[PDB]
């Protein structure tokens, strides 16, 4: 489901970036969001994945976060992930 695509999409950057960078993402997508440090132990799968939602939405948020991760932390590896989002295409037209 689009839970699979928000949680899987987001833990795999969060789990590549370091603590020192992980404090300009959340700077950067979240500024009057203010997302909780102490949070961002489990924010990869259940903080991120919910927080952003409520933003702009569920798929509306992942599809932009690619833009903002990849040309914040990791350009290159950002790449492999707005591939899957292909896939996800076809799996937001079923129930």
Same mark, same amino acid.
């Given at each position: 489901m689009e839970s699979e695509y928000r949680e899987?999409?987001?833990?795999?950057?969060?789990?590549?970036?370091?603590?020192?960078?992980?404090?300009?993402?959340?700077?950067? @997508?979240?500024?009057? &969001? !203010?997302?909780?440090?102490?949070?961002?132990?489990?924010?990869?799968?259940? $903080?991120?994945?919910?927080?952003?939602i409520?933003?702009?939405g569920a798929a509306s948020?992942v599809?932009? @976060?690619?833009?903002? &991760? !990849?040309?914040?932390?990791?350009?290159?590896?950002?790449?492999?992930?707005? $591939?899957?989002?292909?896939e996800a295409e076809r799996k937001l037209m079923t129930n």
């Amino acid at each position: 489901m689009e839970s699979e695509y928000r949680e899987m999409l987001l833990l795999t950057g969060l789990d590549h970036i370091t603590e020192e960078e992980l404090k300009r993402f959340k700077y950067f @997508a979240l500024t009057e &969001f !203010q997302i909780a440090r102490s949070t961002l132990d489990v924010a990869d799968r259940t $903080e991120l994945a919910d927080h952003l939602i409520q933003s702009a939405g569920a798929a509306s948020a992942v599809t932009k @976060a690619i833009n903002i &991760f !990849q040309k914040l932390n990791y350009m290159h590896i950002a790449n492999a992930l707005e $591939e899957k989002k292909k896939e996800a295409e076809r799996k937001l037209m079923t129930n």
